């Protein structure tokens, strides 16, 4: 039941006097604009005077309880839709993480760097099911809630799981407790690329993987909040049998779902796919019937001309993460230039954070990265306008997630999912485009207020219902158990680091 | 300033080994660093102080902070006088009708050349009071973001106004003068000489004379050429003679744009780095802004001369510049061991600061090479501190936390969610922090910023004087109607 998490109706709210970015079809921006919300929905958005006319249509009772929020020193955005994310905070001690020396001077190219260590990546992904099984229900819920809180704190109101090292129902429960929206998934890996083998090794039955997703779908079918959906994913096309691909196509058609995977992510992927599967990623997905309007492809940069045409013909979707490629040693923007090229050719392309095991670039940081990096590559300050970067992190992401019915833009009849950012400091002075100043000089921590379905979850940069110190301390205790027991890191290395945390 | 001990934080030195000290310390005495390293080494230096100096020691527990060297932003322009007209305050809030212009699309070489040659007239039109108010606010914004040493590479402001602003603010400043003696006009097949080289050089020599006597150690000067398009051979040779005679650094912009080389061949008969080399300017004194559109011979001239490149990857995309990826030359020359630093460049409203530029280099150089080790976070810091200081010829006194160097340092708080469990707070800073997260700024042992607020600076007062000055200059010199300016000023969130 929804009342376990939150109680009460939100009534009418008028948020007025700020610059309002709608991310509607026309990318509408309203200086001295306003948003009127009633309960969970936007009723009116536009110039303040026009929206005051909508306020005049409210009855004596709704008017008497109207909450007026003076946003005159603020910018209003739609809530961010981060459709390509992974819960990986259980790996905080080992994944580019807490045990590294403070000096970075001895760092090496590994994992996704240097074109990608395809055997290591494939083997690591196939080990997720065993580690998820090893995680306790208590550990999963504590780690999920803190990890997803960090997304919400940065203005993510709708979050999409594209394959997590956590228990699916733990992440669903965390989303319910936090008040945010969540597209849940399950871990899907049924093949590994092993150095001593001439084809992929099947590591589990496709039907097992599919049944796991069907169990999640069953669990959240009934959900009455409107905040929980699900979307099946394949971890990575290296770890995907033809039986899993065909099974996913059947499942998505039968249940009318979106679909997500990672493909064309790495320079070294194509040769490994040919060696172990006989065919590259997009062509394997296309053979299974998965290159269509339902597909959100993560990264999707290492595509040849034929694979680019398959994506365009299918009206598929790419989620791109340009804020985080460099620190991973990925080259999914500039080495091929394919994602900006497919966007110019009319493919839907959104911006996402991807994830790792400690806080990294959020949606705000990713919007800045796209604005800088796409425009520099083309010598064109108009290729990604700031309002395009916002659309890519809101409406366009919602379209790829098949949630644009309800979220991603401030328009009448959509969910009242909004951010407020303060614009009264030196960064914003004299700029009629506060979103541009935000991309120059602000980020996740400058999100002031986060509203989901008309409910304030963050205000003044602080959780309203979230107990921030308590969520952190439960996450750290859970991480201690999982790290010492499942990852076999000695307590001697873990406990003094947790003791030195600044509380 | 007496003695200050800053102890318990993670200390990034940007010394020659890029040393990082977890739970490290810095001891300063008066204007200088005396000890930096592990707490035990630094406590030995505390016990070596004059007893009266130790009795008055200012102890700062930085255990919830990160300590950095002060940022050295060696390629900057004061352009805040153009806030109403230059990608500025009069634009519509919607960006949908924006066009490729100015430096975008390979560069409008005629417009760029003509615009640069108009700077002298607009500087002359600016009052001394307007210049001082605009400079002090503009330079405050750099200081607020952790810039302790700022380098002028050609400003739309009065040089002595910017020197006075630096003196008032307490920061370090390498002052320059505007130098443009040629224009590339569409109705001509050769450059047009607009001023005499000896007069342009005399303007710089007058500034050098004005700051020669400065007793603070905080004011230096460096001659620049605006842009090689606007540079005669006589100006270039005269600059080489001047910097040899006075033992100065030299700066210009060269190889900045796709369309530059063809315009340089058409109007001057030779490309920029080759023209600088002929004049004797491609040597260890040169800081070249952008310097990406270089052929193999020009790359070899830069390496042979041990010249320096200042790169601004935080701001190329919004300008429509392509000085990172279109040629890849600057990362390649850096891998080859050329000194390459990071700078903010300019514009007329706040844009990417040094912190933002460090993040940009870390993301963008590493993505281009599929190598998370090409620019480590500590490299991005060195590029914005020690290496920048070396290019500015100020590494004698600034750019790193080492005994004998100036006590110029930053404190950044690390006690929030962004930093949790990271043994590398600089990495969390590059992921999720920026200019506004600079908490404390110390120059020569003096605290100028603390808790993100000016100590002697009245930020609201500097702002209000800048806005008044901008109103006068915009209405009078830029001829923008009061009807367009006053409503924008009326809307300011005071
Ligand atoms: O975002 C990912 O999970 C991913 C998966 C495979 C390759 C890669 O570079 C990234
Ligand atoms: O940084 C500059 O002043 C500059 C000058 C010329 C070309 C360009 O792209 C930039
Ligand atoms: Mg409250
Ligand atoms: Zn991913
Ligand atoms: Zn409409
Ligand atoms: Zn410049
Ligand atoms: Zn390479």
PDB file of C-alpha atoms in Angstrom, chain A residues 19 21 26-27 29 31-32 73 93 96-105 107-111 113-115 146 150 153 267 322-335 358-362 365 368-369 371-373 375-382 385-388 423-424 426-427 429-433 436-437 440-441 444-445 472 475-476 479 497-498 500-503, chain B residues 10 12 17-18 20 22-23 64 84 87-96 98-102 104-106 137 141 144 258 313-326 349-353 356 359-360 362-364 366-373 376-379 414-415 417-418 420-424 427-428 431-432 435-436 463 466-467 470 488-489 491-494:
ATOM      1  CA  UNK A  19      12.609  31.393 -15.431  1.00  0.00           C
ATOM      2  CA  UNK A  21      12.195  25.645 -18.765  1.00  0.00           C
ATOM      3  CA  UNK A  26       8.864  23.635 -28.670  1.00  0.00           C
ATOM      4  CA  UNK A  27      11.553  23.626 -25.886  1.00  0.00           C
ATOM      5  CA  UNK A  29      11.219  28.889 -21.929  1.00  0.00           C
ATOM      6  CA  UNK A  31      10.981  34.376 -18.237  1.00  0.00           C
ATOM      7  CA  UNK A  32       8.922  35.349 -15.120  1.00  0.00           C
ATOM      8  CA  UNK A  73      15.254  34.041  -7.426  1.00  0.00           C
ATOM      9  CA  UNK A  93      35.636  -0.778  -1.640  1.00  0.00           C
ATOM     10  CA  UNK A  96      37.865   2.399  -8.653  1.00  0.00           C
ATOM     11  CA  UNK A  97      37.067   2.778  -4.986  1.00  0.00           C
ATOM     12  CA  UNK A  98      37.808   3.325  -1.297  1.00  0.00           C
ATOM     13  CA  UNK A  99      41.025   1.180  -1.111  1.00  0.00           C
ATOM     14  CA  UNK A 100      43.001   3.116  -3.769  1.00  0.00           C
ATOM     15  CA  UNK A 101      46.082   5.059  -2.651  1.00  0.00           C
ATOM     16  CA  UNK A 102      45.476   8.837  -2.439  1.00  0.00           C
ATOM     17  CA  UNK A 103      48.147   9.341  -5.160  1.00  0.00           C
ATOM     18  CA  UNK A 104      46.823   8.584  -8.687  1.00  0.00           C
ATOM     19  CA  UNK A 105      50.338   8.463 -10.215  1.00  0.00           C
ATOM     20  CA  UNK A 107      47.087   4.233 -12.138  1.00  0.00           C
ATOM     21  CA  UNK A 108      46.915   1.808 -15.089  1.00  0.00           C
ATOM     22  CA  UNK A 109      44.567   1.441 -18.088  1.00  0.00           C
ATOM     23  CA  UNK A 110      42.168  -1.390 -17.204  1.00  0.00           C
ATOM     24  CA  UNK A 111      38.560  -2.622 -17.553  1.00  0.00           C
ATOM     25  CA  UNK A 113      39.928   1.531 -20.999  1.00  0.00           C
ATOM     26  CA  UNK A 114      42.318   1.054 -23.915  1.00  0.00           C
ATOM     27  CA  UNK A 115      39.545  -0.218 -26.240  1.00  0.00           C
ATOM     28  CA  UNK A 146      21.432   5.515  -0.287  1.00  0.00           C
ATOM     29  CA  UNK A 150      22.117  10.396  -4.347  1.00  0.00           C
ATOM     30  CA  UNK A 153      19.447  14.720  -4.517  1.00  0.00           C
ATOM     31  CA  UNK A 267      36.627  -0.325 -29.798  1.00  0.00           C
ATOM     32  CA  UNK A 322      29.660  11.811 -22.184  1.00  0.00           C
ATOM     33  CA  UNK A 323      30.251  13.038 -18.601  1.00  0.00           C
ATOM     34  CA  UNK A 324      31.938   9.752 -17.623  1.00  0.00           C
ATOM     35  CA  UNK A 325      33.735   8.254 -20.675  1.00  0.00           C
ATOM     36  CA  UNK A 326      37.158   9.808 -19.991  1.00  0.00           C
ATOM     37  CA  UNK A 327      37.513   8.586 -16.373  1.00  0.00           C
ATOM     38  CA  UNK A 328      36.547   5.046 -17.572  1.00  0.00           C
ATOM     39  CA  UNK A 329      38.987   5.218 -20.550  1.00  0.00           C
ATOM     40  CA  UNK A 330      35.993   4.850 -22.914  1.00  0.00           C
ATOM     41  CA  UNK A 331      36.099   6.566 -26.337  1.00  0.00           C
ATOM     42  CA  UNK A 332      32.358   6.398 -27.144  1.00  0.00           C
ATOM     43  CA  UNK A 333      32.108  10.077 -28.247  1.00  0.00           C
ATOM     44  CA  UNK A 334      35.047  11.177 -30.408  1.00  0.00           C
ATOM     45  CA  UNK A 335      36.756   8.011 -31.730  1.00  0.00           C
ATOM     46  CA  UNK A 358      31.152   5.949  -5.757  1.00  0.00           C
ATOM     47  CA  UNK A 359      29.442   9.237  -6.730  1.00  0.00           C
ATOM     48  CA  UNK A 360      30.335  10.434 -10.224  1.00  0.00           C
ATOM     49  CA  UNK A 361      28.911  12.801 -12.826  1.00  0.00           C
ATOM     50  CA  UNK A 362      25.176  13.385 -12.371  1.00  0.00           C
ATOM     51  CA  UNK A 365      27.332  17.331 -15.144  1.00  0.00           C
ATOM     52  CA  UNK A 368      27.368  20.356 -19.419  1.00  0.00           C
ATOM     53  CA  UNK A 369      29.540  17.640 -21.014  1.00  0.00           C
ATOM     54  CA  UNK A 371      26.976  21.006 -24.543  1.00  0.00           C
ATOM     55  CA  UNK A 372      30.781  21.402 -24.460  1.00  0.00           C
ATOM     56  CA  UNK A 373      31.761  18.216 -26.270  1.00  0.00           C
ATOM     57  CA  UNK A 375      29.594  21.471 -30.035  1.00  0.00           C
ATOM     58  CA  UNK A 376      33.433  21.439 -29.976  1.00  0.00           C
ATOM     59  CA  UNK A 377      33.512  18.300 -32.187  1.00  0.00           C
ATOM     60  CA  UNK A 378      31.380  20.035 -34.894  1.00  0.00           C
ATOM     61  CA  UNK A 379      32.815  23.590 -34.436  1.00  0.00           C
ATOM     62  CA  UNK A 380      29.131  24.513 -33.901  1.00  0.00           C
ATOM     63  CA  UNK A 381      27.786  26.200 -30.730  1.00  0.00           C
ATOM     64  CA  UNK A 382      24.226  25.388 -31.969  1.00  0.00           C
ATOM     65  CA  UNK A 385      21.928  24.177 -27.363  1.00  0.00           C
ATOM     66  CA  UNK A 386      21.573  24.246 -23.556  1.00  0.00           C
ATOM     67  CA  UNK A 387      17.803  23.629 -24.029  1.00  0.00           C
ATOM     68  CA  UNK A 388      18.729  20.574 -26.167  1.00  0.00           C
ATOM     69  CA  UNK A 423      19.883  31.839  -9.519  1.00  0.00           C
ATOM     70  CA  UNK A 424      20.696  34.742  -7.144  1.00  0.00           C
ATOM     71  CA  UNK A 426      27.396  35.700  -9.165  1.00  0.00           C
ATOM     72  CA  UNK A 427      27.240  32.776 -11.647  1.00  0.00           C
ATOM     73  CA  UNK A 429      24.148  37.707 -12.787  1.00  0.00           C
ATOM     74  CA  UNK A 430      22.786  39.504 -15.933  1.00  0.00           C
ATOM     75  CA  UNK A 431      22.261  36.220 -17.857  1.00  0.00           C
ATOM     76  CA  UNK A 432      18.749  36.005 -19.419  1.00  0.00           C
ATOM     77  CA  UNK A 433      19.615  32.274 -19.892  1.00  0.00           C
ATOM     78  CA  UNK A 436      23.424  28.390 -19.651  1.00  0.00           C
ATOM     79  CA  UNK A 437      24.978  29.721 -16.394  1.00  0.00           C
ATOM     80  CA  UNK A 440      28.859  26.743 -17.134  1.00  0.00           C
ATOM     81  CA  UNK A 441      29.273  26.806 -13.365  1.00  0.00           C
ATOM     82  CA  UNK A 444      24.046  18.337  -9.039  1.00  0.00           C
ATOM     83  CA  UNK A 445      24.630  19.944  -5.600  1.00  0.00           C
ATOM     84  CA  UNK A 472      24.406   7.059   4.895  1.00  0.00           C
ATOM     85  CA  UNK A 475      24.592   2.092   3.701  1.00  0.00           C
ATOM     86  CA  UNK A 476      28.077   2.062   5.303  1.00  0.00           C
ATOM     87  CA  UNK A 479      28.722  -2.104   2.691  1.00  0.00           C
ATOM     88  CA  UNK A 497      38.187   3.708   6.722  1.00  0.00           C
ATOM     89  CA  UNK A 498      34.531   3.594   7.893  1.00  0.00           C
ATOM     90  CA  UNK A 500      37.370   8.027   9.456  1.00  0.00           C
ATOM     91  CA  UNK A 501      34.161   8.881   7.470  1.00  0.00           C
ATOM     92  CA  UNK A 502      33.339  12.566   8.229  1.00  0.00           C
ATOM     93  CA  UNK A 503      30.064  12.297  10.248  1.00  0.00           C
TER      94      UNK A 503
ATOM     95  CA  UNK B  10      44.469  15.853   2.010  1.00  0.00           C
ATOM     96  CA  UNK B  12      47.871  18.327  -3.119  1.00  0.00           C
ATOM     97  CA  UNK B  17      56.377  14.566  -8.302  1.00  0.00           C
ATOM     98  CA  UNK B  18      52.697  15.703  -8.070  1.00  0.00           C
ATOM     99  CA  UNK B  20      49.697  14.093  -2.411  1.00  0.00           C
ATOM    100  CA  UNK B  22      46.695  12.255   3.103  1.00  0.00           C
ATOM    101  CA  UNK B  23      46.371  13.796   6.617  1.00  0.00           C
ATOM    102  CA  UNK B  64      37.329  18.028   6.759  1.00  0.00           C
ATOM    103  CA  UNK B  84      25.217  43.682 -22.613  1.00  0.00           C
ATOM    104  CA  UNK B  87      26.728  36.595 -25.997  1.00  0.00           C
ATOM    105  CA  UNK B  88      25.255  38.653 -23.195  1.00  0.00           C
ATOM    106  CA  UNK B  89      22.433  40.245 -21.187  1.00  0.00           C
ATOM    107  CA  UNK B  90      20.224  41.341 -24.167  1.00  0.00           C
ATOM    108  CA  UNK B  91      19.759  37.845 -25.678  1.00  0.00           C
ATOM    109  CA  UNK B  92      16.257  36.331 -25.604  1.00  0.00           C
ATOM    110  CA  UNK B  93      15.843  33.664 -22.880  1.00  0.00           C
ATOM    111  CA  UNK B  94      15.144  31.052 -25.626  1.00  0.00           C
ATOM    112  CA  UNK B  95      18.375  29.834 -27.319  1.00  0.00           C
ATOM    113  CA  UNK B  96      16.491  28.250 -30.266  1.00  0.00           C
ATOM    114  CA  UNK B  98      21.174  30.983 -31.994  1.00  0.00           C
ATOM    115  CA  UNK B  99      23.464  30.997 -35.065  1.00  0.00           C
ATOM    116  CA  UNK B 100      27.049  29.890 -35.727  1.00  0.00           C
ATOM    117  CA  UNK B 101      29.037  33.153 -35.514  1.00  0.00           C
ATOM    118  CA  UNK B 102      32.366  34.739 -34.470  1.00  0.00           C
ATOM    119  CA  UNK B 104      32.325  29.185 -34.681  1.00  0.00           C
ATOM    120  CA  UNK B 105      32.182  27.177 -37.919  1.00  0.00           C
ATOM    121  CA  UNK B 106      35.972  27.428 -38.445  1.00  0.00           C
ATOM    122  CA  UNK B 137      34.395  42.782 -10.049  1.00  0.00           C
ATOM    123  CA  UNK B 141      35.102  36.457  -9.772  1.00  0.00           C
ATOM    124  CA  UNK B 144      36.410  33.685  -5.731  1.00  0.00           C
ATOM    125  CA  UNK B 258      40.340  25.985 -38.775  1.00  0.00           C
ATOM    126  CA  UNK B 313      38.830  22.926 -23.232  1.00  0.00           C
ATOM    127  CA  UNK B 314      36.071  24.064 -20.821  1.00  0.00           C
ATOM    128  CA  UNK B 315      34.883  26.761 -23.249  1.00  0.00           C
ATOM    129  CA  UNK B 316      35.531  25.651 -26.875  1.00  0.00           C
ATOM    130  CA  UNK B 317      32.107  24.085 -27.521  1.00  0.00           C
ATOM    131  CA  UNK B 318      30.028  27.135 -26.445  1.00  0.00           C
ATOM    132  CA  UNK B 319      32.248  29.330 -28.724  1.00  0.00           C
ATOM    133  CA  UNK B 320      31.972  26.836 -31.646  1.00  0.00           C
ATOM    134  CA  UNK B 321      35.771  26.352 -31.472  1.00  0.00           C
ATOM    135  CA  UNK B 322      37.264  22.950 -32.370  1.00  0.00           C
ATOM    136  CA  UNK B 323      40.736  23.375 -30.813  1.00  0.00           C
ATOM    137  CA  UNK B 324      40.682  19.950 -29.064  1.00  0.00           C
ATOM    138  CA  UNK B 325      39.347  17.182 -31.316  1.00  0.00           C
ATOM    139  CA  UNK B 326      39.463  18.462 -34.926  1.00  0.00           C
ATOM    140  CA  UNK B 349      29.629  37.054 -18.399  1.00  0.00           C
ATOM    141  CA  UNK B 350      30.840  34.324 -16.000  1.00  0.00           C
ATOM    142  CA  UNK B 351      31.825  31.099 -17.751  1.00  0.00           C
ATOM    143  CA  UNK B 352      33.919  28.029 -16.981  1.00  0.00           C
ATOM    144  CA  UNK B 353      36.500  28.711 -14.255  1.00  0.00           C
ATOM    145  CA  UNK B 356      35.510  23.546 -14.550  1.00  0.00           C
ATOM    146  CA  UNK B 359      37.222  18.634 -15.119  1.00  0.00           C
ATOM    147  CA  UNK B 360      36.980  19.247 -18.896  1.00  0.00           C
ATOM    148  CA  UNK B 362      40.248  15.086 -17.347  1.00  0.00           C
ATOM    149  CA  UNK B 363      37.078  13.988 -19.203  1.00  0.00           C
ATOM    150  CA  UNK B 364      38.021  15.098 -22.707  1.00  0.00           C
ATOM    151  CA  UNK B 366      41.133  10.779 -21.570  1.00  0.00           C
ATOM    152  CA  UNK B 367      38.065  10.010 -23.742  1.00  0.00           C
ATOM    153  CA  UNK B 368      39.935  11.017 -26.918  1.00  0.00           C
ATOM    154  CA  UNK B 369      42.785   8.536 -26.189  1.00  0.00           C
ATOM    155  CA  UNK B 370      40.646   5.791 -24.514  1.00  0.00           C
ATOM    156  CA  UNK B 371      43.073   6.248 -21.592  1.00  0.00           C
ATOM    157  CA  UNK B 372      41.939   7.146 -18.036  1.00  0.00           C
ATOM    158  CA  UNK B 373      45.648   7.798 -17.196  1.00  0.00           C
ATOM    159  CA  UNK B 376      45.151  12.062 -14.125  1.00  0.00           C
ATOM    160  CA  UNK B 377      43.294  14.402 -11.752  1.00  0.00           C
ATOM    161  CA  UNK B 378      46.704  15.453 -10.318  1.00  0.00           C
ATOM    162  CA  UNK B 379      47.828  16.285 -13.896  1.00  0.00           C
ATOM    163  CA  UNK B 414      35.150  17.520   1.650  1.00  0.00           C
ATOM    164  CA  UNK B 415      32.469  16.764   4.308  1.00  0.00           C
ATOM    165  CA  UNK B 417      28.069  13.134   0.032  1.00  0.00           C
ATOM    166  CA  UNK B 418      30.197  13.872  -3.085  1.00  0.00           C
ATOM    167  CA  UNK B 420      32.226   9.972   0.867  1.00  0.00           C
ATOM    168  CA  UNK B 421      34.662   6.966   0.865  1.00  0.00           C
ATOM    169  CA  UNK B 422      36.907   8.517  -1.816  1.00  0.00           C
ATOM    170  CA  UNK B 423      40.624   8.481  -0.824  1.00  0.00           C
ATOM    171  CA  UNK B 424      41.061  10.915  -3.783  1.00  0.00           C
ATOM    172  CA  UNK B 427      38.732  13.224  -8.139  1.00  0.00           C
ATOM    173  CA  UNK B 428      35.370  13.847  -6.383  1.00  0.00           C
ATOM    174  CA  UNK B 431      33.333  14.806 -10.771  1.00  0.00           C
ATOM    175  CA  UNK B 432      30.887  16.973  -8.842  1.00  0.00           C
ATOM    176  CA  UNK B 435      34.477  27.210  -8.698  1.00  0.00           C
ATOM    177  CA  UNK B 436      31.722  27.929  -6.126  1.00  0.00           C
ATOM    178  CA  UNK B 463      28.746  44.058  -7.870  1.00  0.00           C
ATOM    179  CA  UNK B 466      30.311  47.093 -11.640  1.00  0.00           C
ATOM    180  CA  UNK B 467      26.615  47.327 -12.655  1.00  0.00           C
ATOM    181  CA  UNK B 470      28.501  48.794 -17.050  1.00  0.00           C
ATOM    182  CA  UNK B 488      17.728  44.295 -17.008  1.00  0.00           C
ATOM    183  CA  UNK B 489      19.471  46.204 -14.165  1.00  0.00           C
ATOM    184  CA  UNK B 491      15.579  42.771 -12.498  1.00  0.00           C
ATOM    185  CA  UNK B 492      18.982  42.079 -10.775  1.00  0.00           C
ATOM    186  CA  UNK B 493      18.515  39.845  -7.664  1.00  0.00           C
ATOM    187  CA  UNK B 494      20.210  42.279  -5.179  1.00  0.00           C
TER     188      UNK B 494
END
